[PDB]
């Protein structure tokens, strides 16, 4: 589930 | 997540071959590639001819075209009550998405014979010479026709605020919601209608389905019946709307673009075959129900602008054909003054009486033969000193009924004070007035009325008639004014 | 502020997309899964 | 007269002929005949010499259906064969008999049970994957079918795979999935 | 040839549809073998719709139409004053020639 992986990895990217 | 999709064997101008889809439907909802929607309108047995609802920049050839499965449907509901949405219900004001539940067609079938009952109740505008001489009832299609630039949208905004006394007051049956389909105009002149609608307190209660000049002709073919479709929803469920097509000259000429696009055999003027099968599919839905279904209501006020009052044309005598009247306006009256340049002679309502509170129609019914008396005349002014003194008193009396008939703009009036006014135009009170003076005393007056008479105004409010008790305190009031006025 | 609520959460979400493209064969071998699981 | 159709349609003249020829052929039993000798007839009116001759527009078109005559019965013509030549011959639709081949083609494509299908992905696989791939879209079909795969090898997807099996048409590559993103985020 | 010639496939009404003449150009002058001339107005992509600058007797289908390289082109100059001349520049007052040294499209 790479569009899972990505929106977490950003989340914590962005926070 | 599979779908059954096509090729694109060309596009353009709005319209999209498909190569495929060997089981879409005739007005079946596609979905492209670049995220927007059509609708399948030609199936033929090679192809399927698509009009595309955006802009034909987002395709390109061999692009895939999934189905959805379902019938062109807009949402609906009261969700959509203050949005500005485009012909698909996709917001466009910037406020969050619509929080919708439920979606029903744009092709609906109109109520049959038996779930309708007579027109009865009046639709208040705030216009008196519309409330007084062409009323409109709640289940009627009152067609506005006139030139450019005379005063429609007007007329429309103006109905549209009226209702505020109503939307905001505690009654639930005289609660009326408006929805304002716009066609063909610039978004420019939408912003300026929200910003006069919000200002008003009118955008609580309104919906508006802008499809703007710039948009794509399927946009424009679809706007009004979205808006009809999200005015039915409040029919079918027992509440009351009111819809505005402005307007559906414009409708006609987008749906003309697509059918010569499609290869569709060309009529008068160019026009396909069935465009009144067009107009008159999307007015019959407005209809007024029975207390066996709900008792709601849908009125319909569609627009037409017409080219040097050439009401002889094909859409507006289509549109004339199928509504319950019209309401003419006219540039000649726009310049003479006369604002709204409503023509009383040539404007009708075929439901008339019917539609009318019993004040009104006490006074209006004088009022409108007095005024056909003084139009039947009317030529014989500019020699009025050389003529009989009876007929003199009959365009006197005319020509201060008629100034009491300009009213300005969004400012429509309450029913009662429009018959309290009109009953002090009728009853010769302003004979001895000059004209140059009776606005001066129709805005006086009115705000003396509503100052230290309230009750009477309460009275005629929750009557709907001019009792012989308020007949008297009426000539009271008026006479105590005049004598006070200057 | 709360355009500034806006502007800045419009710009991180597309910060956030722009930045992900640089980012395996697993992800085919489980489309197949995906295809296998289709019936 | 009663004709019965192929289970493909194609249109215009070149779809006309097609499935007249397959009515034909079919009311005599000779479609696999009729196929190739259509085929090999096509390959014969390509070669530079009858294939130039065949489109001259001033070539009387009794002389020129008598000369495509005497070239096609030196190769043991079956009739029905001959019989369409002549028919689009005399009819001065010999421009298109290739593409009427073609049809036909594309018709016993579908006699056969052919299912063409296309599996584009990111880069070129190899064929483990592919062969359980082969299983795996072999497994939606019904009753008595072939399957065709033509596979492309496109970057632009950025990766996962897409499937386009005839009409049905499934969209797994990351592309789609990243624009899902967008709208789904930015809406 | 079919790149500088062509063959006439129809004609009828002052419109010769010809085959062939891949290298003309529009709005250029071509050459019926019978004299008279012609402009190839069309360039479809089976044929050359030209307009014949003359009687349609004097062609026939299948005649041979010859690429001039020459777009229409008439005499100017002084010499031309009070000379009754047609619309391509050649005189019809019977009184000779022109003394024309120019030229212009
Ligand atoms: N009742 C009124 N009294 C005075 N002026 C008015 C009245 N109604 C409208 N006007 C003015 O007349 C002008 C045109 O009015 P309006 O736009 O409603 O007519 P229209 O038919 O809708 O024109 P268009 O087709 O371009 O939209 C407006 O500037 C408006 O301010
Ligand atoms: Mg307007």
Redesign the interface.
């Given at each position: 589930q790479k569009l899972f992986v990505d929106k977490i990895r950003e989340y914590k990217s962005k926070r | 997540?599979?779908?059954?999709?096509?090729r694109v064997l060309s596009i353009g101008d709005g319209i999209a071959r498909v190569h495929?889809?060997?089981?879409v439907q005739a007005e079946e909802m596609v979905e492209f590639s670049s995220?927007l929607k059509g609708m399948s309108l030609n199936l033929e047995?090679?192809n399927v001819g698509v009009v595309v609802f955006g802009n034909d920049k987002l395709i390109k050839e061999g692009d895939?075209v999934?189905r959805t499965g379902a019938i062109v449907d807009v949402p609906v509901g009261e969700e959509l009550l203050g949005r500005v949405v485009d012909a698909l219900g996709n917001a466009i004001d910037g406020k969050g998405?619509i929080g919708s539940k439920t979606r029903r067609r744009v092709g609906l079938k109109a109520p049959g014979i038996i779930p309708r009952i007579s027109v009865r109740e009046p639709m208040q505008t705030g216009i008196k010479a519309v409330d007084s001489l062409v009323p409109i009832g709640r289940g009627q299609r009152e067609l506005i026709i006139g030139d450019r630039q005379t005063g429609k949208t007007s007329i429309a905004i103006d109905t549209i605020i009226n209702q505020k006394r109503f939307n905001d007051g505690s009654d639930e049956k005289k609660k009326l919601y408006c929805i304002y389909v716009a066609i063909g105009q610039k978004r420019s002149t939408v912003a300026q209608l929200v910003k006069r609608l919000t200002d008003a307190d009118a955008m609580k209660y309104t919906i508006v389905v802008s499809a703007t000049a710039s948009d794509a002709a399927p946009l424009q073919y679809l706007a009004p019946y979205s808006g009809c479709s999200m005015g039915e929803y409040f029919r079918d469920n027992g509440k009351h709307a009111l819809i505005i097509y402005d307007d559906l000259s414009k409708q006609a000429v987008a749906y003309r673009q697509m059918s010569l696009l499609l290869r569709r055999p060309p009529g008068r003027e160019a026009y396909p075959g069935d465009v009144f099968y067009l107009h008159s599919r999307l007015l019959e839905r407005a209809a007024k129900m029975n207390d066996a279904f709900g008792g709601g209501s849908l009125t319909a006020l569609p627009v037409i602008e017409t080219q040097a009052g050439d009401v002889s044309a094909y859409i507006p005598t289509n549109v004339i054909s199928i509504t319950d009247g019209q309401i003419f306006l006219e540039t000649e009256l726009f310049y003479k003054g006369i604002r709204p340049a409503i023509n009383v002679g040539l404007s009708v309502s075929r439901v008339g009486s019917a539609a009318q509170t019993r004040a009104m129609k006490q006074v209006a019914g004088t009022m409108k033969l007095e005024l056909a008396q003084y139009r039947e005349v009317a030529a014989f002014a500019q020699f009025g000193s050389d003529l009989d003194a009876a007929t003199q008193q009959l365009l006197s009396r005319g020509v201060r009924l008629t100034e009491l008939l300009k009213q300005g703009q969004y400012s429509p009036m309450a029913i009662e004070e429009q018959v309290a006014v009109i009953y002090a135009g009728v009853r010769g009170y302003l004979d001895k007035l000059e004209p140059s003076k009776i606005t001066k005393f129709e805005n006086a007056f009115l705000s003396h009325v509503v100052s230290q008479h309230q009750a009477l105004l309460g009275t005629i409010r929750a009557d709907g008639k001019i009792s012989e008790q308020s007949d008297a305190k009426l000539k009271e009031i008026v006479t105590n004014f005049l004598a006070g006025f200057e | 502020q709360n355009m500034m609520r806006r502007k800045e959460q419009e710009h991180m979400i597309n910060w956030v997309e722009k930045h992900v493209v640089q980012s395996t064969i697993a992800k085919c071998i489980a489309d197949l899964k995906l295809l296998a699981k289709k019936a | 007269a009663k004709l019965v159709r192929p289970p493909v349609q194609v249109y215009g003249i070149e779809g006309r002929y097609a499935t007249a020829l397959y009515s034909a052929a079919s009311k005599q039993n000779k479609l696999e005949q009729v196929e190739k000798e259509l085929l090999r007839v096509a390959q014969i009116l390509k070669e530079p010499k009858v294939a130039a001759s065949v489109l001259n527009p001033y070539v009387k078109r009794s002389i020129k259906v008598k000369s495509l005559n005497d070239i096609t019965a030196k190769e043991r013509f079956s009739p029905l064969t001959t019989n369409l030549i002549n028919l689009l011959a005399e009819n001065g639709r010999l421009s298109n008999t290739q593409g009427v081949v073609s049809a036909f083609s594309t018709m016993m494509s579908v006699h056969r049970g052919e299912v063409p299908c296309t599996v584009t992905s990111a880069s070129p696989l190899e064929e483990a994957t592919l062969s359980e791939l082969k299983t795996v879209l072999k497994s939606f079909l019904s009753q008595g079918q072939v399957l065709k795969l033509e596979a492309k090898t496109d970057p632009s997807i950025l990766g996962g795979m897409i499937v386009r099996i005839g009409e049905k048409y499934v969209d797994m590559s990351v592309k789609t999935k990243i624009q899902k993103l967008g709208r789904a985020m930015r809406e």
């Open positions: - | 997540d599979l779908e059954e999709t096509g495929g889809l060997r089981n995220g047995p090679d895939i999934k998405p | - | -």
